[PDB]
Structure formats: C-alpha cells, structure tokens
Design a protein around this ligand. Structure first.
Ligand code: A1LV1
Ligand code: A1LV1
Ligand code: ATP
Ligand code: ATP
Ligand code: CFF
Ligand code: CA
Ligand code: ZN
Ligand code: ZN
Lengths: 727, 146, 48, 49
C-alpha cells in the first residue's frame, strides 16, 4: 500500500533509523568484550534483523529509480561512519572462520590440548595480510586470556557466527537489492566492495527470482535457501526425474500445462525429498525391518549391477552345455574343461541372482510406490474437488478402477492434504444432498466428528480395500511390470538353468541407443502392422494364380515316384510361398522350374518378375524402411529438446537473442534470473514459513498458488524489458 | 614409421602403408570417422545383436537339434547342435550371413514334428537378424556419414 | 515425403490463424492466447 | 594435470614460451595467502631470497 509508504517517507523515520544505526554500531563493539555479555547481544541482532525487513517491506512495490530508493541510500551515507563499523564487524568476524581453517596456524599451535597461545596466534593473524593492526588486539580482547596461552580458536570461530547468521544474510539482501535497483551510485560501489565477504558467504544461500504481479510489473524477489534444501536437491535420484521432466514437457507438452506440470513436478519433488529424508541415516522387530529396508533402498541402483554381472557370469558358463547319445534318452550335461566344481558355481550363481532380483523387487516398493500413488491420489482429489469428476459428471478404466478408493478413511494418507473431503463437501453439499455425497465419501460421524476436533498385529493395523487398490495400481506401472517379468523368469530359471538366457536381454533395455531401436520397432510398428497385413494379402493373391494355373511347375519330385507336390493343398502353398518365396533373394522363380515348356512360359516369366519387384524389392524394403526411419526420428527428437533448451529461457518467452546482445548474456539470465531450479526452491521456502511471515509478494504468490492460477509467471519480460531502458 | 622397419622382416608388410590413401583424402577420412564416431553408440547394437543370436542358439540346442545336421554320408554325421560353444558359432558363421537367414542351412520341416514351430523359428530369425538388425547396423554407418 | 506432407499440415494449422494472417505469436504473448483467438474470435466454423 | 606435475620444478619450464616471469607473477599474487616458502618449494625457485 503506497499510502503508508508515502507517509513513512515523509516523517523523521530515517532520522529515527539513523539514531538506531548509531546505537547499533557502538553497542556491539562494546558488548563484544565479554562472555557474560552474550545473552544481550543475540537480542540486538534479532532486533536489527526486524528493522531491515521493515526497510525491505518499505522497498517493495519499488520502481527502478524511485525516491524511496534514493532516500534509502543517502540515509545510509548520512550514516556512513557507523554503517561501515557494523559492516567491518561482519567483515572481520567472517574471515576469522576462513583463516582458522588453514593449516598454517594449526601448525602454529603445538599444544596437544588445542589451547593456542595468544601471542602465537597474534603473529598468526599478523602473518596473513588481510586483517589490520588494530584488529588483532580487538580480537585478543575478544578472546579469553586464560593465563595468556589459551584462546581456544575452535570455539572462538563459531561463537559469534550462529547468532549473527541471518542478519548478515539480511543486510546483504538490502545492499544487493538497492544496488540492483538504482544504478550509478559510487557510494554503493564503495559499499559493495566493503562488504564483499558477506556477499560471497551469502550468495549460495541466497536465491533470486522474478515474478510479475501487482498490476503488470516484474520485480526481483529474494529469499533464504537452507543448507538442507540444497543438499537433497543435488541428488541423482532427484536429478534423473529432472532430466525426464525436461524431456517430456518441451517435447510433447504445450505451453499451457508447462507451468501446471512444473508445479506438479515441483510437488513431485517435495514428496520424494521428504521420503529421502525419511530414509536418511517378542519386541525388537521394528529395528531389524527398518535397518534392512534402509540398506536395500540405499543400494538399489548399486544393487542392480550385481544382478547384471551375475546374469553375464551364469550365461557365459551356460554356453558350454553339450548333448550326447550315451550319458558319461539323451542327457544334457556340462563340459567343465577346468574347475570340475563349475556346475556347482552355476548353481550358486543362480540362487544369488534370484535373491538379488527379490531384493530389487522389494527395494522398488520403497522408492517408487509412494510417488506413483501420491501422484494418482493428488490428481484425482484436485481434478474431483474442482471440476467435479464423480458428482456432476461420470466417466475411463483409470477412473472406473479408482471408484473403490472413495470410501476408505485413509484415502489421502499418502498425501499432504488431508482435508480434501471437507473441501468438496462444503463446496458441493448444497447443490446435491449432503447426506448423499457423504455416503459417497463414507464420512463417519459427519454430523458428529467435525465438532469434536473443534472443541477438543494384523499387518500392524487392519487395512483392506486401500491395499487391494494399491496392489492393482502398482501392478499397472510399466517399470514394475518389467521388474516383475525379470523376477518371474529368475525363479523359472530353476526349472531349467537355460532360462537365465532371457536375463541377458536386460542389456538392450537399459543402454539408451538399444532402447531407441526397440522403441522404433514398437512406435511406428503400430502403423506398420497394416503393411505386413498388406504384405499377407500380396503373397496370398499370388498363391491362387498358381493353385489354379501353374501347378505342374511347382514340384519337388526328389526321384521318380518321390514327387512331393506343393500346390495341391493351398493351406500349404501359401505357406511354401512364405517359407521360400519371401526369403530367397531371387523371389520365387529360384524354387521351381524353368519355363522351358512354352506352355504359359511367357505368362510364367511374367509371374516371377512381378513377384520380384513387388514382394522382394518393394514391400520387403518398405518394411526395413519403416524401422530405419523410426530409429532416425527417435534420434532427431532427442536432438531437438537439446537445441530448444539451449535457445530459450524455459521460464519467460524469449530466446537467446535479447539476452544475447551482451557478454554471456543468456547464462546470467539462466543461472541467476531464471533458474528453473530457483522457481522450485522458492516453493519449499514458501511452504516452510508460517503464512503469518509471508511478505506481500510472499502471500501474493501463495494465495494464487492455493487456487492454481498461474499468472505470476513472467511470460514476456524480465526487467530487461519492463525497465529495459532505465538501467 | 614402425610398420616400415617391420616391412624389412617380410616385404609384404609394406601392404599396410597402402592405407595411407584413406587417411588423407577428405571423403575417405569422413567414412572412417563415421564408422568411429556413431560406432561408439553402435557397440551397444552389436552387443544387442549378440544377445539375439544367442537366445536363438538355445531354443535349438534344447529342442530342434535333429534338424541341425551336416551328415555328409551315413556314418559321417557331423553334428552342430551338440556342443553349444560351437552352435552359437555355427549360427554366427552361416546364420548371420546367408541372405535366407538360417533355414537355408538345415532341413525342410517335412517331419511335421514341430514343423509349424520350426517354420516359425526361421521366419522369425529372418525378420529379426537379417532384415532388421543387419540393416540397423548399415543404417548407423550410412547416417553417420550423412 | 508422403509422410512428411501429412506432418506439415498439422504444424501449420497449429501455428497460424487460418483466417487472419498472424501465427501463434502476437496471440501468444498471453495465457492461452491462441486458443481464445481460435475458439472465440476466429473459428473457421464460425465463419461458416 | 597429473602428468604435468613434473614440470613445476624445472627452471626451463616456460623456455618455449614468450612469458618468462610467470613464476614471479603467481608468487607475488598468492605468496601471502599461503607460505611463500612453501609455494617457492612448489616451484623450485632457487635463490628466491
Ligand atoms: C533394464 N532396467 C532395469 O532397471 C533393470 C531391472 C532389473 C530388475 N528387476 C534388473 C536389471 C539388471 C535391470 N538393469 C539395469 O539396471 C541396467 C541395465 C543396463 C544396461 N546394460 N547394457 N550394457 C550394460 C553394461 F554391460 F555395460 F553394464 N548395461 N544398465 N543398467 C543399470 N542402470 C543403472 C544402474 C545400474 C544398472 Cl545395472
Ligand atoms: C596420412 N597423412 C599423413 O600426413 C601421412 C603421414 C606419413 C608419415 N609418417 C606418411 C604419409 C605418406 C602421409 N600421407 C600424406 O601426407 C597424404 C596422403 C594423402 C591422401 N592420398 N590418397 N590419395 C592420394 C593420391 F594418390 F592421389 F596422391 N593421396 N595425401 N597426402 C598428402 N597431403 C599433403 C601433402 C602431401 C601428401 Cl602425400
Ligand atoms: N532457465 C534456463 N534457460 C535456458 N537454459 C536452461 C535453463 N535452465 C536450465 N537450462 C539448461 O539446462 C541445463 C540445466 O540442467 P542440465 O542437467 O540440463 O545441464 P547442467 O545443469 O549444465 O549440468 P548438471 O546439472 O549435470 O551439473 C543447463 O546446462 C542449461 O543448458
Ligand atoms: N482458426 C484456427 N486457428 C488455429 N487453429 C485452428 C483454427 N481452426 C481450427 N484449428 C485447428 O484445427 C482443429 C479444429 O478442428 P480439428 O478436427 O482439426 O481438431 P479438434 O476440433 O480439436 O477435435 P474434434 O473436431 O474432432 O472435436 C483445432 O483442434 C485446432 O487445432
Ligand atoms: C506439507 N506439504 C505441502 O503443504 C505441500 C506439498 N506440495 C505442495 N504443498 C502446498 N507437499 C508435498 C507437502 O508435503
Ligand atoms: Ca505479516
Ligand atoms: Zn527469460
Ligand atoms: Zn487471427
């Protein structure tokens, strides 16, 4: 609201702030000289944290060159000599941790207790040329004396770091906000170099973002990112979902759902990061089951290499079975040229792969099932309580099977929202009978259980229909079905050891190029079945011309009496034609007789040459054609995506052009302004606040998120336009 | 230089100094660079093509073995699907190279015994190994050159 | 080629108005811009 | 990089290059953050004093 931000811009509020600036720079540098003064000083840092966030919330709705920004900067330079004293206090107490991490001063202490001598550590700081002369006696006075041989550099590093943590980040925000807001202020240029160390210690934990709301203006929004949110973001199990999410959105997804899938992907990531934080490192039993499933999930991707190298090992040995008439009827024995325990080696290798495949099947059920079930249950709950899927209209085999989940009490139990039953009830309980829709949902004590919360081992529990529904939906996952085929054939491998030869095909199913060839055979092969359907009709019209007429020709009379005939019974000749006809290179003529007997010859010679051209030189090439071209396209789509993502923003709607008329323009636009990652992180910040601490834009983007309208995304600019010129 | 001095051991090793023709004249280097560059992504295809012939060589070892035989004359009954290590080989010496897939080098499924199954075993060979895989490979090389 | 011409048409009709002479650009600088331009403003069906 | 570690101590390291003062460049640039006796032993600057 401007009407308050105008009145605050015209009082003596700056002159109030200047007095607060002068008391802050002098209270700390007096209070930094005792251990028994530290209780007071933590309160002071939390106070000026709350002061500068008032300055930030005063500087929201800010234009690039506005008088509020200009009254902010001269007030900082009317309060110069103290504001560097607070800046140098942040600057000295941050390099103190980085200096003591060097081994040059751990070598300067010879005490095994760690109690470094004061004059020894005094010349240590005098050895490095970054601090000043008066700084070390300021630091020696900050140190404890303890018979002048003990400063205890370890506790001295982190003592004044954790209470000074958020405020040192927060002052860097205001300095980098105003410097990014107004250009050409050399006092700010004096300020930014004076506070360089607090910038780089608080540049990775910072994140920038740019949203456009509040009557068509984009503005830089700033936030904190924890160490924990960046630790479980740079995991490959999270990253593999990201590389797929890059693919299927810019390839087949339109521009509309590309934000809706994005926040769904953002909602997808928070669940799997939560479940990765869940697994991060008589009675009893619980301990054993928990420790087991943690180790199993921890391996998983590393466990699978053991299954593959075992299938190679058993199959290489199994490439030695020999058959004989007499055993050393026919028996299938093993050759064993050396190591006569090599059949016992194969027997051991089989068990190990079946157990390993079992230990994969079970580890897949704690790093997949929760993600796919959450994804269905969220989609269903939102697409119901908004569009009315099961109350206004009616259906789909995905919908028809999911009818059985509308009455379990633990329906959203693997989802963050648990009040979606009361949501669509209080939204649609007046258009229809609310007793009916409660019976549709099975809300027990719908008249009674709502006010009670207001005023005040069979599988462990006893679950039923929600487990049957879960087991159906997980059985439907293509990647679970493959891993179930791999497990099935492993146990079937104990019936006859040769069935471990089918576990070799896993080679084709993982290594990219191979999967591309099989996907080429399948994708365009749906359009190909009509070609081989047409190719049947062709050989078939050929097999009648012969049956009727040329039959004397078609004969394989071995010798006199022996006169095997081929075009007597059609059911066979079509077959013959398909066993030697389509495969012979020389079409069909090769497998019959010279049209010597002029009888029909000319006609006979026309019958072959026509076969050729058609079946062998045309059709049998079209088929190859299909496959090859499919592979080619496959390879081309993979290409595309690459280019695209390396030629557009993916967030705003501008390629590397406007952002190209400048050295490393694009990059800066990606790594700082528009980092898909940023737009994500933003959300766990938003999610983890309290709704009472959200700022203006921080509540504004939240309340638009909570009803799923997506107009805060820029889509057309990025300061490089809205303010294009002035800058 | 190495092969030049090795050319004094047997004068025929100067035949390897002929390949320098391919290594200089543009187009030629393009063909060999095509074989190498996409051929790194190709080794997984010929790795897949091994698995294919191999799953074929078990179906036979177990079942159809009576068919696989090159009995020159009576007593002389050279067998092929007795020792696997050989039959995989056989299949890779006449199977992949014959134009008519494998059937050409065995016997008519006259004896109905399994015939239908035997006839399905060949026509499937064809399509797969000779008309699909052995084309993908060519495909890779040609497209790389392109 | 046959397969490629069938492709083309598709793209074209999903990248131009078919009534006025502007692609999904000026009508793209806005949420679901094109659609609104087709389903309400320029619906070939409408002109019929 | 691992094979090129053996060139950091020959005196004729930049001897087939136009710059010959690159030893004094990174010494006078980084001899205060670390021990300049250490980085001279890393470079093998004889009579560095
Ligand atoms: C098929 N996909 C599967 O998930 C799969 C499911 C089940 C079940 N139940 C069992 C196995 C063995 C599976 N297979 C892989 O899991 C797998 C295969 C390959 C490609 N393969 N071809 N060549 C090469 C090699 F020889 F060079 F190694 N590897 N990689 N790969 C892989 N990926 C990531 C981590 C570890 C691996 Cl082992
Ligand atoms: C392979 N590259 C090499 O550098 C090379 C290294 C060593 C060593 N040790 C020895 C030789 C002979 C080398 N070869 C060439 O040096 C060379 C080959 C060709 C192509 N070749 N194909 N056809 C034709 C021809 F028949 F028509 F002549 N030439 N041109 N060419 C070329 N280039 C530029 C200048 C002179 C020449 Cl001779
Ligand atoms: N907002 C963006 N604008 C343009 N390109 C982007 C944007 N975001 C991501 N990219 C592209 O996608 C990549 C981001 O993640 P990606 O996994 O595809 O590669 P990377 O980040 O460079 O390497 P890695 O993540 O493995 O360390 C960038 O390299 C960049 O090329
Ligand atoms: N004025 C237009 N501008 C852009 N695209 C158009 C326009 N008119 C029609 N189209 C395209 O052609 C389609 C219109 O009829 P079409 O049969 O091709 O597909 P559809 O209408 O979406 O599906 P259906 O008609 O079978 O219910 C639209 O989907 C749309 O993609
Ligand atoms: C608690 N919670 C949320 O509040 C949330 C979410 N995704 C979106 N929101 C809002 N996830 C995954 C979540 O666990
Ligand atoms: Ca508030
Ligand atoms: Zn952009
Ligand atoms: Zn138009």
């Amino acid at each position: 609201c401007t009407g308050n931000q105008q009145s605050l811009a015209h009082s003596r509020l700056w002159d109030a702030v200047v007095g607060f600036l002068h008391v802050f720079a002098h209270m700390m540098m007096k209070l930094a000289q005792d251990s028994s003064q530290i209780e007071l000083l933590k309160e002071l840092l939390d106070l000026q944290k709350d002061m500068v966030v008032m300055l930030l919330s005063l500087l929201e709705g800010n234009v690039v060159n506005g008088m509020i920004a200009r009254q902010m900067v001269d007030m900082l330079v009317e309060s110069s000599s103290n504001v560097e004293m607070i800046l140098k206090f942040f600057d000295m107490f941050l390099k103190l941790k980085d200096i003591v991490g060097s081994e040059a001063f751990q070598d300067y202490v010879t005490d095994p207790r760690g109690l470094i001598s004061k004059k020894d550590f005094q010349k240590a700081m005098d050895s490095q040329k970054q601090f000043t002369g008066p700084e070390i006696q300021f630091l020696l006075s900050c140190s404890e004396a303890d018979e002048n041989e003990m400063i205890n550099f370890e506790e001295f590093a982190n003592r004044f770091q954790e209470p000074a943590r958020d405020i040192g980040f927060n002052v860097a925000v205001l300095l980098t906000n105003l410097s990014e807001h107004v250009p050409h202020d050399p006092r700010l240029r004096n300020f930014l170099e004076l506070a360089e160390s607090i910038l780089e210690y608080f540049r990775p934990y910072l994140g920038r973002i740019e949203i456009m709301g509040a009557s068509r203006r984009i503005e830089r929004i700033y936030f904190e990112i924890s160490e924990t949110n960046r630790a479980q973001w740079e995991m490959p199990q999270v990253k593999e979902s990201k590389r797929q999410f890059i693919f299927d959105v810019v390839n087949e997804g339109g521009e509309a759902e590309k934000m809706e899938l994005f926040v769904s992907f953002c909602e997808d990531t928070i669940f799997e990061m939560q479940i990765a934080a869940q697994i991060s490192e008589w009675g009893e039993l619980e301990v054993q089951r928990v420790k087991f499933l943690n180790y199993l999930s921890r391996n998983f991707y590393t466990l699978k290499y053991l299954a593959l190298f075992l299938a190679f090992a058993i199959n290489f040995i199994l490439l030695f079975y020999k058959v004989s008439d007499s055993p050393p009827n026919m028996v299938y024995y093993f050759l064993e040229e050396s190591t006569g325990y090599m059949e016992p080696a194969l027997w051991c290798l089989s068990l190990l792969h079946t157990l390993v495949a079992f230990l994969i099947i079970i580890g897949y059920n704690c790093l997949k099932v929760p993600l796919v079930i959450f994804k269905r249950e969220k989609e269903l709950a939102r697409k119901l309580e908004f569009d009315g899927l099961y109350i206004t209209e009616q259906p789909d085999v995905k919908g028809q099977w999911d009818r059985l989940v509308l009455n379990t009490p633990s329906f959203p139990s693997n989802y963050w929202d648990k009040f979606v039953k009361r949501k669509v009830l209080d939204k649609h309980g007046d258009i229809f009978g609310r007793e009916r829709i409660a019976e549709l949902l099975g809300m027990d004590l719908a008249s009674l259980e709502i006010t009670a919360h207001n005023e005040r081992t069979w599988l462990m529990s006893i679950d039923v229909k929600y487990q049957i529904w879960k087991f159906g939906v997980i059985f439907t996952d293509n990647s679970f079905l493959y891993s179930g085929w791999y497990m099935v054939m492993s146990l079937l491998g104990h019936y006859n050891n040769f069935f471990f030869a089918a576990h070799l095909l896993d080679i084709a199913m993982g290594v990219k190029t191979l999967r591309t060839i099989l996907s080429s055979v399948t994708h365009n092969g749906k359009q190909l079945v009509m070609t081989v359907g047409l190719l049947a009709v062709v050989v078939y019209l050929y097999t009648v011309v012969a049956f009727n007429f040329f039959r004397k020709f078609y004969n394989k009379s071995e010798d006199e009496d022996e006169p095997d005939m081929k075009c007597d019974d059609m059911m066979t000749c079509y077959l013959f034609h398909m066993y030697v006809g389509v495969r012979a290179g020389g079409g069909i003529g090769d497998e019959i007789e010279d049209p010597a007997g002029d009888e029909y010859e000319l006609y006979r010679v026309v019958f072959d040459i026509t076969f050729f051209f058609f079946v062998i030189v045309i059709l049998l090439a079209i088929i190859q054609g299909l496959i090859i071209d499919a592979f080619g396209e496959l390879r081309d789509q993979q290409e595309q995506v690459k280019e695209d993502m390396e030629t557009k923003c993916f967030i705003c709607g501008i390629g590397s052009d406007y952002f190209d008329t400048t050295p490393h323009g694009f990059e800066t636009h990606t790594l700082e302004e528009h980092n898909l990652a940023n737009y994500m992180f933003f959300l766990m910040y938003l999610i983890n606040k309290d709704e009472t601490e959200h700022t203006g834009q921080e509540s504004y983007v939240w309340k638009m998120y909570q009803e799923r309208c997506w107009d805060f995304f820029p889509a057309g600019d990025c300061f490089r336009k809205q303010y294009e010129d002035q800058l």
